[PDB]
Every structure is written in C-alpha cells, then in structure tokens.
Amino acid sequence: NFSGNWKIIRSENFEELLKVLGVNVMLRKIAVAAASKPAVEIKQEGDTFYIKTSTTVRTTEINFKVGEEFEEQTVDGRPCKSLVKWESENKMVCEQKLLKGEGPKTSWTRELTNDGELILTMTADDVVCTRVYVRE
Ligand SMILES: [Cl-]
Ligand SMILES: [Cl-]
C-alpha cells in the first residue's frame, strides 16, 4: 500500500515536461535541481490519501479520495481540478482540468510494484516524465 516516506531512485524527462509547458530555462533548471532529492510522505486510508511532496524550495500537500474531485496544481503550478480513479489494483490515474484558461493536457499516475517501488508518471500532451521511489 502507499503509506510511508518515500525517497527518489530514478527520474527521467522532468526538464522536458516543464519545457513543453512553457517553463523558462532558468526556472526549469532551478526546478529540476530543487526536486532532485525530494521528500514524499503518503498516508493512505483505503481510498483516502494525503500526499506531501517537498523540494528545496516548495512544499505541496494534497488530500483526496479516489473518485472525488479535488483542487491541486499542475506540475508547472497552475491551479486545477483533479480526479483520481483506480485503473487496476494499485495503480491510480489522475486527470487534471485547469480552473482558468487552457493549456496542454496534463495527467499523472501513481502505481506500486510488487517489490514495493512507487512509480509516478506525469504527462503533458505527448511528453511523459517517470520518477521512481522506494520507502525509507
Ligand atoms: Cl529527470
Ligand atoms: Cl517528487
């Protein structure tokens, strides 16, 4: 199950994800370094989740239940309305809809492997970033 404190072990394509969302080079470079050793805390109670992710300069906290819309931010920091569903046993998928304006379609997935790794994917249109974590 997803509860725990998680440390990153792999990251692919993060800078490009930000690039396609229009994030400028200075901010991209700052963000990638800032998130290179994040702190991720998850508390799962059935279908209810608390997820806190902290970088060197940012901290985000979401509280949601699978199947119930909630507000969060896109990876580039725009407010959005999100909805998580279970795709399969321990794989949740989230569609995001901007609160204001338009932009590239964004989504994320979080799944647990049999070996206890957490895989996050984040997509912005046709660009996918994958980050893998393990429990502390
Ligand atoms: Cl990366
Ligand atoms: Cl992260």
UniProtKB/Swiss-Prot annotation:
GO terms for molecular function: cyclin binding; fatty acid binding; retinal binding; retinoic acid binding; retinoid binding; retinol binding. The keyword rRNA-binding does not apply. Keywords: Cytoplasm, Endoplasmic reticulum, Isopeptide bond, Nucleus, Retinol-binding, Transport, Ubl conjugation, Vitamin A. Transmembrane segments: none annotated. Induction: By retinoic acid. CDD domains: CRABP2. GO terms for biological process: embryonic forelimb morphogenesis; epidermis development; fatty acid transport; positive regulation of collateral sprouting; regulation of DNA-templated transcription; retinoic acid metabolic process; signal transduction. A motif (Nuclear localization signal) lies at residues 19-29. Transports retinoic acid to the nucleus. Regulates the access of retinoic acid to the nuclear retinoic acid receptors. Interacts with RXR and RARA. Interacts with importin alpha. This is Cellular retinoic acid-binding protein 2. It comes from Homo sapiens (Human).
